[PDB]
Ligand binder design. Structure first.
Ligand SMILES: O=C(O)CNC(=O)C(=O)O
Ligand SMILES: [Mg+2]
Ligand code: NI
Ligand SMILES: [Zn+2]
Length: 331
């Protein structure tokens, strides 16, 4: 069995290997990359996502989210308070302000210490989940707006034609902006490209050990657990590496820098934080190996998780028994 310790693997494809996206994912899995839940892909040196980032400041963040924490430093939830719209140029200036900017630090490990010590005492503002793309249309390789769609994969594997679309999302971050512990909708893959700015630190639990994280989360968030049998789908809970180590949960960590891709694999729980002003693009995707994960994915039916139009068909076709209850949660 390849990668039996479930370490995060880092890949350096050549420009030739960068042509066929599906083939490269399948290659990485042949080497055991999925066992970690997360992999890093460094694009070939010849590749670029677009020519420059000089003209992005007029993109609108219609609903910036202030991430307000509750709990203790290593075990907390966050809620998202909606703020007034602002442009990317306005948000960059805010991220760089004395109130929100990255503190002085020695290295990524020092910054990680400072994040876990201090995150809860601040409420950073995240421009998340903005439909759109920063890939130039002429970028033919690993262009996250030109991937094969999940609907077409389901149709190719299973023969059923379904409605829905699959488009990318932009994330504009600042110091301390936080992504809570989650797997993807329907336990899909994700791919994330850091277009510019400061790094993003990731934490990940191997898919084979995801239920260990779930059982800890039910212990640590006991009211949330009573409210919903899949409350990590709400995407609000944080647990620090120190707490994970104290409770024996297997995980790994890695820092993504500008110009690098990360892939999350089906049922790979992940969480993380931004080091400073940055912009990432991400999208979900599927492969043949996902289908079985999709059929077994948990679902929130309490009403909190509320998701896209296109998840309807995935539930309806892969999980017909759950469909009725889940749809009640969506309505
Ligand atoms: O970058 C972020 O805030 C969150 N991204 C992801 O969870 C992802 O790409 O799967
Ligand atoms: Mg612009
Ligand atoms: Ni994710
Ligand atoms: Zn729920």
């Amino acid at each position: 069995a390849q990668n039996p310790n479930c370490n995060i693997m880092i890949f350096h494809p050549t420009k030739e290997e960068f042509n066929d996206f599906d083939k490269y994912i399948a290659y990485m899995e042949s080497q055991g990359a999925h066992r970690a839940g997360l992999a890093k892909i460094i694009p070939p040196k010849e590749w670029k996502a677009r020519e420059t980032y000089d003209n992005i400041s007029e993109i609108l963040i219609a609903t910036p989210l202030q991430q307000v924490a509750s709990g203790r430093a290593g075990v907390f939830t966050q809620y998202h308070k909606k703020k007034k719209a602002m442009t990317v140029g306005e948000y960059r200036h805010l991220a760089n302000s004395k109130k929100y900017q990255t503190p002085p630090h020695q290295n990524f490990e020092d910054l990680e210490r400072k994040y876990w010590k201090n995150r809860i005492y601040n409420s950073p503002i995240y421009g998340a989940d903005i439909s759109g793309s920063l890939f130039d249309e002429n970028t033919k390789q690993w262009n996250l707006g030109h991937l094969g769609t999940i609907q077409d994969l389901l149709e190719k594997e299973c023969g059923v034609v379904i409605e829905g679309v699959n488009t990318p999302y932009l994330y504009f971050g600042m110091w301390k902006t936080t992504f809570a512990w989650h797997t993807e909708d329907m336990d899909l893959y994700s791919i994330n490209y850091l277009h510019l700015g400061e790094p993003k630190t990731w934490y990940v639990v191997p898919p084979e050990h995801g239920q260990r994280l779930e059982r800890l989360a039910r212990e640590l968030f006991p009211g949330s657990s009573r409210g919903c049998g899949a409350f990590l789908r709400h995407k609000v809970a944080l647990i620090s590496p120190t707490v994970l180590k104290e409770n024996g949960i297997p995980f790994n960590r890695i820092t993504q820098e500008a110009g690098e891709f990360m892939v999350t694999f089906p049922y790979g729980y992940h969480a993380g934080f931004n080091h400073g002003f940055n912009c990432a693009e991400a999208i979900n995707f599927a492969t043949p190996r996902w289908i079985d994960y999709g059929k077994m994915a948990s679902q929130c039916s309490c009403g909190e998780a509320r998701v896209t139009f296109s998840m309807d068909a995935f539930v309806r076709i892969l999980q017909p028994e759950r469909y009725d209850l889940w749809k009640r949660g969506q309505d």
